[PDB]
């Protein structure tokens, strides 16, 4: 069964036992007079529970019923301390339910009895999933903070609610408020929980308490794509120096963005986030002024020096494919089967020559230039995880599938040599169509060439191959029908259709008008040919091509703001990708340090404004 | 280092010494009680300054602190007369800083002490640059005028501020108000400074005081593209004659637009301005009614007479290329190397003939028709400056690179004659593909043909050659992979790929479907050919061509208002370009003169309205 149909059984079987039991019936309906009388004559033993396993007070708190709920707590002393027992609802007590409803007087009544403010709700319907519409955490302080009810929030802290508790995923009360869809109404709540902070607990500040996967609530505001909470967490870390007219020289702290850490870099997590909204943190005023300083000062010359050691490499690999050891044809086997054109095979002559030694040192450059590419890509596979890394389209994208299968086919051609294999022309032709089309990677600078090469990528996955599933059928339709008409005829006159793997290939060419329409006006073609071909020229090359241009012409202004918003996030992905690699010799640390103009040990970045 | 990182050192090193010095610490924080006490026991010698070099009063004026600033001027008599000394902040006194903040009582206190209202602020952070967010000039009267604080403006004039002073660039107080982004709020200020005018200084009016590069503030309102200040400066120079119902016959002055000057023409500077907004002065009501009078009356017939002396010239140059002295082939060298087709070379026979004398007078027309083009373009290079002139796209554009390299190749062909050189067919083929494609210049009239020939120019720089950087790679990818498969084979059967400069050229043709797909069905092509060619027909001629049509199809309605706004500014550029050239015989001066209907010596233009 699906889980969606499993919980629909439980939420409806609960509604049966409320109808069956007379005590639970009056709780929902606020029948006070029954609940006074039915609790006199042996007030019912409260293991009498629903199929979920809840007491009468959980039913009385699930509905807005003050007066019936208080009469149950007077007769029964301990209903505030009982959990539910069904597996998607484990531990949800009456205090978890009264807080959710924002019921002001019922929470006051429950806390007067001493209900535990540290009860976990560990059910399978409270954890975060794409098929649960709420994620409010486990502790009841977290329930009050997410519903925007500030009066219950300050009421629980006065009774012992600890703002430093964590749920099973590790999220504290601050991690959850960033994960809420109501973005602009949690900033009022985040100011409140900092005033209740102990300021005694050394655990360093609550803003720096880590998740299980390592994210602090500052660092989680970036990954989530929360542009409102990012500015709020930055008001603590800027200093205003002077205001001279319209100018204002404010001074940002730059420590939780200038992370000098082994793998938890803030600028890595923002660009490699799967959330679409994370590409807008990169335009906020302490960050946009930073990654346009790394790029224009250092990241642009090191990416133009290194994009011409890769043109001078691929121009050293084609001139060692052209010059390759072809002897003369030492055989007369081309005279049988006059259909064959073939001539001179191969050699083993890198040694005995005057111009295969200049060719030799042009090969060992290409041999030890395809092992360096394997040493800079393979240990970068495991860090991201081999399935995110080949598909992000920003963090490299599908230019790491090409750049490895280029460097793998240079090493095969070495093993095709030194053992005297024959088909050396098969990897050399796959290397040169992939090796040059990887030089197209280095248009990630060059604002001119930049956003164009995304559109090639976006029209080869989205809009070309949905045109090609419905044309592997039309060129199987007509191509297997031209083979039938010319199966009778002679192949010496109009012999484009002589064998069935070329019946498909001549018809795929006729689709593109590359080959002309096959006609011979000195002979009688069969009459069935000119009917099937007058239908092929309307479906294939009026309609199906001129509608593919139109499909290309309207999905290009839909992606108008979206490829240009994606290019500026592809310069930031290049700058952090280089800062892992190049050694510390190159790249002094960004920002003016502060131990000589002595305030501390932090590394600052100065940005001045103009009030328009 | 960058200059941007250099000033971030200085603005932060200043903030250190404020923390270090106890006197400067209390000035920022408005600690009045410390500043009373610390100035009793040897009030500190005010060469004690920041790293910029400022006194305590500059720090007290940099913040909104009235009471601390007055206590410093009572103890120390001369802090109003001290400048800062750091090179990007030279000369900025306390009065330059109090005016910027729009502090009303502190400026009153400084002027009561006699601070100099003529102190220049000659720092390197006040000059105009694309990396300084303000340009407010140097004198403190200019600081008050730009911040929109009219009360400080009239206060400084009463104490001796001279509205006729100039800064290092030469801009007066009126030149700066036109350069401000707050356009519609300086018109209220420009009325104010004219009422304070002396009207005693012969220097003719303040509206006519020149810059260092010659621009008056009227003439600077056009170059900058300020459509609001242009109408305000024109209200002084129009006369209303009568109002007859809805009609109103107003009469414009037309003297600072009718400039009869050597090089400072108002209509030249507006069209050749690099600012984008300058193409909207040409639609204002005293100017749009002028350049549609020069064009429709005189500028249209002189541009149609002269665009048919250039068709009757290029039709006299092709019929002297067709008829050229070819003899018969006097050699049998074409019989060796039967691959050669060649035949009859050349002569020296312009003399001995009956029909090379009619050809002779058809050559001397083309010889002395390519020296006239050199005499009308070369002395026009130096006037604009050889780097603006070849790239404006309005003031001629790239039809002066063609029209000179046409007239240069007619003179080479003369030197290829008279000395008996051989390769005369090499300049004649470059002259005829450039000489006709320069007749396309004369679609700058003809509203039909007009805006079309801009779009050819805008799709040959913007959108064709960003398609060609990523296809010098695909036709180097496949073309160097077809040479590898047919390097074995014999060139007599399927020999499109026989030499590597034609392996590129057959594959560039296959991209455009011009040449058919190279196939020969009577022989066995290698099997590797039909795999590499089934990938070439999808990448090159489904995807890459049909996406170039789509790129052409969506960047054409972006430039929809923008090529038609650019054509009407290309008729105005032609009209003033002709008025330099053609002599005074042709073209009586525009507008009705006024010494016979005697008011003055000015030349007027009458325009009547209709109130809708």
UniProtKB/Swiss-Prot annotation, chains A, B:
Residue spans that sit within the membrane without traversing it, per the record: 498-518
Q: Give the reaction(s) catalysed.
A: Ca(2+)(in) = Ca(2+)(out)
Gene this protein is translated from: Trpv5
Which species does the entry assign this protein to?
Oryctolagus cuniculus (Rabbit)
Q: Which GO terms describe its cellular component?
A: apical plasma membrane; plasma membrane
Q: What does this protein do?
A: Constitutively active calcium selective cation channel thought to be involved in Ca(2+) reabsorption in kidney and intestine. Required for normal Ca(2+) reabsorption in the kidney distal convoluted tubules. The channel is activated by low internal calcium level and the current exhibits an inward rectification. A Ca(2+)-dependent feedback regulation includes fast channel inactivation and slow current decay. Heteromeric assembly with TRPV6 seems to modify channel properties. TRPV5-TRPV6 heteromultimeric concatemers exhibit voltage-dependent gating.
PTM annotation, UniProt: Glycosylated.
UniProt family annotation = Belongs to the transient receptor (TC 1.A.4) family. TrpV subfamily. TRPV5 sub-subfamily.
Q: Which residue ranges does UniProt annotate as crossing the membrane? A: 302-322, 360-382, 394-416, 423-443, 467-487, 531-551
Q: Where are the ANK repeats?
A: 18-48, 52-81, 90-119, 136-165, 169-202, 213-242
Spell out the subcellular localization from the entry: Cell membrane; Apical cell membrane
Q: Which residues are glycosylated?
A: 332
Included range, full protein: 27 to 638 of 730
Just give the chief location class.
membrane
Q: Name the GO terms of the biological process aspect.
A: calcium ion homeostasis; calcium ion import across plasma membrane; calcium ion transmembrane transport; calcium ion transport; protein homotetramerization; regulation of urine volume
Binding-site list for Ca(2+):
516
Positions on the Cytoplasmic side per record topology: 1-301, 383-393, 444-466
Task: Kindly provide the name given to this protein in its UniProt entry.
Answer: Transient receptor potential cation channel subfamily V member 5
UniProt tissue specificity: Detected in kidney cortex, in distal convoluted tubules and cortical collecting ducts (at protein level). Detected in duodenum, jejunum, ileum, kidney and placenta.
Annotated region Interaction with S100A10: where?
572-576
- Subunit relationships: Homotetramer. Probably forms heterotetramers with TRPV6. Interacts with TRPV6. Interacts with S100A10 and probably with the ANAX2-S100A10 heterotetramer. The interaction with S100A10 is required for the trafficking to the plasma membrane. Interacts with calmodulin. Interacts with BSPRY, which results in its inactivation.
List the keywords (alphabetical): ANK repeat, Calcium, Calcium channel, Calcium transport, Calmodulin-binding, Cell membrane, Glycoprotein, Ion channel, Ion transport, Membrane, Metal-binding, Phosphoprotein, Repeat, Transmembrane, Transmembrane helix, Transport
Activity regulation (record text): Activated by WNK3.
């Amino acid at each position: 069964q699906d889980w969606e149909q499993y919980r629909d059984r439980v939420n409806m079987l609960q509604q049966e036992r409320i109808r069956d039991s007379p005590l639970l019936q009056a709780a929902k309906e606020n029948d006070l007079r029954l609940l006074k009388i039915l609790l006199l004559n042996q007030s019912c033993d409260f293991q009498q529970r629903g199929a979920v396993g809840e007491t009468a007070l959980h039913v009385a708190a699930l509905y807005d019923n003050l007066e019936a709920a208080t009469l149950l707590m007077e007769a029964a002393p301990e209903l505030a301390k009982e959990p539910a027992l069904c597996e998607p609802f484990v531990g949800q007590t009456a205090l978890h339910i009264a807080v959710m409803n924002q019921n002001l007087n019922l929470v006051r009544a429950l806390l007067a009895r001493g209900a535990s403010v540290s009860a976990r709700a560990t059910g399978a319907a409270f954890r975060r999933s794409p098929h649960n519409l709420i994620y409010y955490g486990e502790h009841p302080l977290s329930f009050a903070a997410c519903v925007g009810s500030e009066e219950i929030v300050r009421l629980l802290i006065e009774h012992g609610a600890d703002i430093r508790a964590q749920d099973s995923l590790g999220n504290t009360v601050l991690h959850i408020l960033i994960l809420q869809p109501n973005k602009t109404f949690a900033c009022q709540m985040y100011n409140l929980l900092l005033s209740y902070d102990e300021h005694s607990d050394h655990l360093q500040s609550l803003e720096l308490v880590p998740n299980h996967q390592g994210l602090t609530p500052f660092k989680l505001a970036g990954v989530e794509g929360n542009t409102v909470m990012f500015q709020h967490l930055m008001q603590k870390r800027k200093h205003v120096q002077w205001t001279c007219g319209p100018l204002t020289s404010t001074l940002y702290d730059l420590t939780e963005i200038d992370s000098w850490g082994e793998e938890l870099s803030f600028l890595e997590l923002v660009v490699s986030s799967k959330k679409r909204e994370a590409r807008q943190i990169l335009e906020q005023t302490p960050v946009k002024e930073l990654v346009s300083f790394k790029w224009k000062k250092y990241g642009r010359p090191y990416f133009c020096v290194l994009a011409s050691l890769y043109i001078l490499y691929m121009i050293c690999f084609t001139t060692c494919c052209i010059y390759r050891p072809l002897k003369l044809r030492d055989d007369n086997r081309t005279d049988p089967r006059d259909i064959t054109i073939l001539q001179q095979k191969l050699l083993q002559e890198a040694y005995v020559t005057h111009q295969d030694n200049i060719r030799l040192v042009g090969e060992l450059v290409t041999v030890t230039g395809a092992v360096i590419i394997l040493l800079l890509e393979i240990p970068d596979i495991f860090r991201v995880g081999a399935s995110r890394y080949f598909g992000q389209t920003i963090l490299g994208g599908p230019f790491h599938v090409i750049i490895i299968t280029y460097a793998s086919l240079v090493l095969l051609t070495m093993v095709m040599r030194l053992t005297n294999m024959n088909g050396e022309v098969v990897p050399l032709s796959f290397a040169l169509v992939l090796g040059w089309c990887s030089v197209m990677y280095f248009a990630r600078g060059f604002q001119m060439l930049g956003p164009f090469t995304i559109m090639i990528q976006k029209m080869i996955f989205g809009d070309l191959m949905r045109f090609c599933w419905l044309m592997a059928v039309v060129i199987l339709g007509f191509a297997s029908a031209f083979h039938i008409t010319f199966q009778t005829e002679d192949p010496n006159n109009l012999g484009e259709f002589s064998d069935y793997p070329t019946a498909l290939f001549s018809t795929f060419e006729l689709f593109l008008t590359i080959i002309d329409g096959p006609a011979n006006y000195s002979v009688d073609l069969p009459f069935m040919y000119c009917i099937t071909y007058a239908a092929f020229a309307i479906i294939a090359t009026l309609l199906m091509l001129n509608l593919f241009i139109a499909m290309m012409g309207d999905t290009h202004w839909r992606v108008a703001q979206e490829r240009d918003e994606l290019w500026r996030a592809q310069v930031v992905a290049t700058t952090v990708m280089l800062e892992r690699k190049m050694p510390r010799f190159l790249w002094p640390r960004s920002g003016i340090c502060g131990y000589e103009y002595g305030l501390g040990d932090r590394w600052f970045l100065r940005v001045e404004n103009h009030h328009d």
